[PDB]
């Protein structure tokens, strides 16, 4: 528990199909899904550690198992966090806890085993079947704030196959009634295939490509959100047109019908191309003419709702408008020619075209919302009897074919309006910065290891931009921070060629933007203290015309190659170990005397990257905003750790969620026991209950404070935190015929909201008193209770033996004095120190040793990149065999384990 | 271009005449590139052509280039430097001496057609003398 | 203690008999889940003869219930394990031991 532990562990990696399913209010996605995994080969012990193979489901946002070491002893796969739920033949895995699950003929997943996974988002629940035999266990009541995808996690030595139904793997067992094959969940714009998850690295023709974050859909992206139109009231001067617009669109529609070959006939015979409605709009039946009259009215009403200004301009143009002549051949049995008004003169402006796009989107979204209300859902394969459609998805996710199929009709409609002579002013498109992500924390930074820092000489390296988006490349100081944008501070001199800027302590125009395939050559000359950039061999010049990009550079501790890729970006960093691989070194730099950065290194240069997994780190002693004071105990107060906001109530003040914990955990016992104000010696010396309080200072709104405990695997940097955001799941085990034997609740955050203890009358008014929330834990029974101002609360929790819990406080500061960890005690209740430190196990005197300190959650941190990666082969075996994943070459790593943090 | 730059450096009236021309005509040298010695096209053109000159000097010849630069500092004529190199054909950068002369030399061999060249001691002396003179005068120019 | 839970099935017929020599691989863990021993780390099967009291009572009673080729998890209480004394420096006093044992062959 004190010395760091070491051990050799297998590398573990995850593979999924690009299938995403979720739930949301009014979503267009079906609820029940089913898939299978068949195991062809497994080597139980390819290395000294047992082979890893787990199958199950995972949540889009949150399941980010990076290669190397993570929670516990590394090798993180399905079920090693509260975002994934896995099965390994013998155990249900979740939250890094394995719970044995009964099944006929139990055994670890072996060759020729078929695992059937069922996900019912209605309950919600996840269930398994092994070789058709039910697995007597279920996951339920888990969070539904993302998209779920099938996943298999594995170590080297496996060969398996996803069976997704249809032409993507024929199921070996019949899906349970109501569940849908997962091959139906593939989005219209995508093609089914197997991919890794949250990869920062891949292979490519000339070497490894570095990859930026991947843009992921949200479960709310499937909710059609059209603009309301019923409250719109049609104006009379639009009403007059409404009719003629209906007739004109009908003329065009019938023209297209006859072009495609439609003939007039009394009944819907598409086989013979018969068309009773091919008759004139005036001759068209009244219900149908009215139906068209509506769609027209909705078109104009949507035009109004978007904010478009529509106004009569020229009646002379309306008079001039002439119907195009129709060939006599176009005369079908309708006995009518659908004459359209020749609108050739009319030209659409680019803003008008964007408007047409918006009308098409709104119309499609309205239709989709209506169908969802009827009870329809999306499906790659149409099924009219089942109310499953291949188009029932929000417009943004539709394939280009249908999108243009709609834009054509909408553009013709607006053309008709303009021809009738209407000024059509698009709304002022007020900029709306989406800022969906934190820019500083979004782009992933890849840098060379600090030990490679160069302090003299003339060095060169190359960076090919596979994509053409946001990427920066250049030289960084060893102390570069991971959460700051490159060049936003003084620690990096970089070039951002999406718009052609230099970055150091800010941006400046420089150079020209690259295109796909362009190679930027970065040179640093430490004899002249300059930095030069070349694009495809040609030096990039400033506006002033200077060849150098930066000058008067202080050497300091040296420089490192660095790059940053934004979401969806791909680069290729060539440090020049193989001098022949460099593409423009000879053209510029070789004769100038620059040396490739890694010219004479036996081994490839190690790199580190900015991992976006929030981690708890001690509060920096020089933090610009947060200060922690270690208050000594007195005769009337216990030891305390007080938090204050230095920059409160001033310009530059930072006000955001703050997630704090204490450096040391309390650990529950291995076995739980079977079923005036002076401490009583025997009670205090035989008690297993421990206490600590949090004082929320007056002026700090209790509604912005959460007090309690966290487990070692809390990694949520949620700026809008609520107790509803806490990860939770229930694992239920029973017999063959139900009869639940056990139902365990698993979570990583056990807290009480400060708003629960605000008096209903006091609500809405600031208070002048402090709020003291006390937390009690019985390490021998697993029970957790809370009190507020001495009054017991109704919130209680139950944890399993061996659970580690860190005291924690989540707060949004609203005052200079925020909160105070009070490490005191109660009558016959021991302080935290007695549970945290073995030497103090029987010492009732509260203490706060130096090791106990306040830590805050930091969103990004540096992480070493493995020098070698698992070689996974994914391929479509066949229309019946499914999609095969294979991994045969073993790969191990020596892992250093911090006992107290369980990572 | 190198001989023209050498004349620009040696002869001194030519400098005033260039400067007077540029100032009197108010022709912006920066516009042509994209007043001062840097703006002077005589040195700029040679700085642009220099890589093409260094490219005919094999990496092994760097030490000879330094020696020739020393002679030109001693103010020897071109013939004197030519004879100096001719007799001191030795003192040629050895590949085993440093890794730099290994990877540089490998890359230089890589270029097609660079196998028959450097066979001729007269050829080596030609190139070293020329590039050394150019570099020497460029040094004087860049650092007054 | 000892309780045995199958992981992979064996032949189900050939069981160790007193006096036979069992060849096994094993991976030892404390009840907390901390590895403390593994024959696979040394890459050499461990051999022991039943009845000679060479291994702790937990192994003696557990491996006897496994068929050749079977892999199984043995959970051994302290009393059947090193118990109160505790193998100093490795096993704390009063520790329950969890082993992942594969019975390769008999000889």
Curated annotation (Swiss-Prot), chain B:
Tissue expression per record: Detected in muscle and myotubes (at protein level). Ubiquitous. Detected in diaphragm, skeletal muscle, esophagus, spleen, submaxillary gland, adrenal gland, cerebellum, brain and in testis germ cells.
Location within or outside the cell: Sarcoplasmic reticulum membrane
Post-translational modification: Channel activity is modulated by phosphorylation. Activated by reversible S-nitrosylation. Repeated very high-level exercise increases S-nitrosylation.
Mutant phenotype after disruption: Perinatal lethality, due to severe defects in skeletal muscle development. Neonates do not breathe and do not move. Mutant mice show defects in muscle fiber development. Their muscles do not show a contractile response to electrical stimulation. In addition, mice display abnormal curvature of the spine, thin limbs, and an abnormal rib cage.
Task performed by this protein: Cytosolic calcium-activated calcium channel that mediates the release of Ca(2+) from the sarcoplasmic reticulum into the cytosol and thereby plays a key role in triggering muscle contraction following depolarization of T-tubules. Repeated very high-level exercise increases the open probability of the channel and leads to Ca(2+) leaking into the cytoplasm. Can also mediate the release of Ca(2+) from intracellular stores in neurons, and may thereby promote prolonged Ca(2+) signaling in the brain. Required for normal embryonic development of muscle fibers and skeletal muscle.
Quaternary structure, from the entry: Homotetramer. Can also form heterotetramers with RYR2. Identified in a complex composed of RYR1, PDE4D, PKA, FKBP1A and protein phosphatase 1 (PP1). Repeated very high-level exercise decreases interaction with PDE4D and protein phosphatase 1 (PP1). Interacts with CALM; CALM with bound calcium inhibits the RYR1 channel activity. Interacts with S100A1. Interacts with FKBP1A; this stabilizes the closed conformation of the channel. Interacts with CACNA1S; interaction with CACNA1S is important for activation of the RYR1 channel. Interacts with CACNB1.
Free-text comment about domains: The calcium release channel activity resides in the C-terminal region while the remaining part of the protein constitutes the 'foot' structure spanning the junctional gap between the sarcoplasmic reticulum (SR) and the T-tubule. Pore opening is mediated via the cytoplasmic calcium-binding domains that mediate a small rotation of the channel-forming transmembrane regions that then leads to channel opening.
Recorded family membership: Belongs to the ryanodine receptor (TC 1.A.3.1) family. RYR1 subfamily.
Protein name: Ryanodine receptor 1
UniProtKB/Swiss-Prot annotation, chain C:
An annotated GO cellular component: cytosol
KW GTP-binding (keyword) present: no
Reported regulation of activity: Inhibited by both FK506 and rapamycin.
A biological process term (GO) from this entry: heart morphogenesis
EC number, as in UniProt: 5.2.1.8
Residue numbers bearing the N6-acetyllysine modification: 52
Major subcellular site: cytoplasm
List of residues that carry N6-succinyllysine: 52
Record localization: Cytoplasm, Cytosol; Sarcoplasmic reticulum membrane
Keywords for this protein: Acetylation, Cytoplasm, Isomerase, Membrane, Rotamase, Sarcoplasmic reticulum
Catalytic function, reaction form: [protein]-peptidylproline (omega=180) = [protein]-peptidylproline (omega=0)
InterPro entries: FKBP-type_PPIase, PPIase_dom_sf, PPIase_FKBP_dom
GO terms assigned for molecular function: FK506 binding; identical protein binding; peptidyl-prolyl cis-trans isomerase activity; transmembrane transporter binding
Residues of the PPIase FKBP-type domain: 19-107
Any Pfam family matching the protein: FKBP_C
Membrane topology recorded in Swiss-Prot or TrEMBL: Peripheral membrane protein
Top-level EC class: isomerase
Role this protein plays: Keeps in an inactive conformation TGFBR1, the TGF-beta type I serine/threonine kinase receptor, preventing TGF-beta receptor activation in absence of ligand. Recruits SMAD7 to ACVR1B which prevents the association of SMAD2 and SMAD3 with the activin receptor complex, thereby blocking the activin signal. May modulate the RYR1 calcium channel activity. PPIases accelerate the folding of proteins. It catalyzes the cis-trans isomerization of proline imidic peptide bonds in oligopeptides.
Quaternary data: Interacts with TGFBR1; prevents TGFBR1 phosphorylation by TGFBR2 and stabilizes it in the inactive conformation. Interacts with ACVR1B and SMAD7. Identified in a complex composed of RYR1, PDE4D, PKA, FKBP1A and protein phosphatase 1 (PP1). Interacts directly with RYR2 and RYR3. Interacts directly with RYR1. Interacts with GLMN; rapamycin and FK506 abolish the interaction with GLMN in a dose dependent manner.
Family as reported in the entry's similarity comment: Belongs to the FKBP-type PPIase family. FKBP1 subfamily.
Identification of the protein by name: Peptidyl-prolyl cis-trans isomerase FKBP1A
Organism name: Mus musculus (Mouse)
Lineage: Eukaryota, Metazoa, Chordata, Craniata, Vertebrata
